[PDB]
């Protein structure tokens with residue numbers, strides 16, 4: 044028995060984190076080969092943030108306006124350019140700790156690990172989901188800007204996310220490592236609103252499977268459902284509609300537990316309609332949606 | 345806004361994890377300088393586990409019965425000895441990735457990070473508390489035995505825990521890196537029972553403080569309490585009694601929030617007596633006890 048929300052081991056990312064300072068603005072950068080990647084708003088003052096012209100602000104900056112520190116080592120900036128919303132600082136030294144890495148763009152509902160950093164120094168690691176509305180319920184914002192999100196496959200760090208901002212509602216938003224925002228957000232101090240935040244249905248079903256693998260079975264009923272009937276109920280409680288592809292990725296958990304996917308959907312239907320009646324599942328009083336099927340399979344062999 | 349259960353960055357521990365095999369038994373070892381530390385029950389078959397004589401089983405083993413693999417590198421064992429419940433394998437090579445480290449013994453209610461490993465390979469990292477009954481609600485047991493728990497202070501890994509076993513109830517138990525068990529447990533396949541598992545009161549108060557720092561204030565009432573009156577209620581709901589020392593360590597969170605410790609105790613008293621009335625705190629429907637005051641202070645600057 045046991046089911047923890049686990050982050051990926053962070054070591055390969057720790058060796059890439061640097062401090063980037065431009066005047067009184069300090070944040071976190073990612074140092075891969077001879078490039079440091081960071082949020083372009085490092086070149087802005089808190090006043091500049093209302094309606095920045097990033098191209099003109101960037102033109103005004105020279106190499107020597109960027110202080111990059113790796114531990115207690117100052118890196119020399121020899122080039123500065125912009126790719127969408129990320130600043131790229133070419134430095135004179137290739138990161139000798141550079142891992143095997145890719146840049147990927149993840150889908151709403153997918154999970155990743157954040158290496159939370161304070162002013163270029165790794166502070167902590169957590170696992171989260173990209174909400175359906177492309178926001179992140181992140182750690183307390185404390186010198187945290189430019190912290191990155193990543194998955195590990197085999198020997199490769201897949202960098203999927205960089206923190207750029209807090210929205211006025213206190214949720215986090217940011218970009219892929221190509222500097223394209225997730226969701227309709229912009230790196231300027233404008234009242235910006237997120238879409239309505241739905242529960243990630245396939246993740247909730249994956250977690251009910253984790254619960255069953257752990258011998259939690261109280262919420263299994265004798266019913267089944269059709270996808271169509273389930274989705275009528277789901278929509279009423281602000282759950283994403285379940286798709287055939289999502290039923291398909293739950294197949295291995297079905298096979299292992301002896302519980303057909305649509306039977307688990309009929310359990311979830313009743314949990315939504317009736318609540319938990321003051322019981323818990325894997326120690327939780329709420330349905331958890333931050334485990335993908337693949338996360339549950341990873342942890343359960 | 346934001347409050348995540350964060351683990352320590354795991355990189356310094358990743359470089360110390362090895363596979364230890366004795367016959368058909370494989371588990372995780374910790375390689376620091378020229379010593380590999382692991383659970384002594386690696387020398388036992390599943391049959392040996394009923395009533396092992398570890399001294400006699402160990403005497404029967406030679407160096408070459410221990411297969412230690414670091415990544416895809418075989419380490420030569422040149423010595424085997426026992427310190428309480430941990431096996432120590434002297435190897436011909438000092439771990440060139442050995443961090444600055446200490447061995448500490450933690451107190452019930454203290455938190456640490458576990459680097460969950462599968463057969464010598466880092467799999468994931470999570471933050472947990474040592475329960476008052478000295479058990480760990482750990483990750484799913486999957487090639488996980490010998491995985492270690494640690495804190496980081498400044499540049500130093502404080503190793504506090506090594507997983508030895510699952511109890512029949514599915515909770516985890518283990519030892520300090522000196523091989524002394526936490527709690528009344530023994531590394532043998534005997535029906536072993538834990539003491540009653542109390543809620544870590546000072547951790548719950550620390551988390552209500554985190555909630556307030558994050559602008560969650562619905563559960564603040566106009567009352568105060570005495571320690572004595574609070575502790576009468578606490579004991580009835582299976583909360584550890586609050587001590588003066590515990591009031592003392594909450595002082596910085598009191599100062600920052602403008603909420604006196606005994607005023608937060610009066611909020612907790614009412615939450616225990618009345619429940620949450622279907623509201624949540626920091627997105628939870630249950631009171632969380634896996635953040636120390638020091639964890640909340642770390643994350644909130």
Ligand SMILES: COc1cc(C)c2c(Oc3cccc(C(F)(F)F)c3)c(OC)cc(N[C@@H](C)CCCN)c2n1
Pocket residue numbers: 068070082084085087088089090092184185186187188207208232
């Ligand atoms: C780079 O993007 C960031 C990052 C943070 C943490 C921000 C913050 O909040 C913090 C709250 C507590 C602690 C911290 C600190 F630890 F980081 F200092 C920040 C703010 O509100 C106070 C306001 C922001 N907007 C810009 C105008 C900042 C300067 C221009 N690049 C912030 N911008």
Ligand SMILES: COc1cc(C)c2c(Oc3cccc(C(F)(F)F)c3)c(OC)cc(N[C@@H](C)CCCN)c2n1
Pocket residue numbers: 369371383385386388389390391393485486487488489508509533
């Ligand atoms: C070393 O202490 C361990 C570790 C685990 C995971 C154990 C386990 O459970 C597992 C469940 C699923 C997957 C796994 C595996 F991935 F590890 F294989 C183990 C068991 O029940 C099946 C039984 C145990 N007791 C001993 C008799 C094992 C051999 C003597 N050293 C286990 N002992």
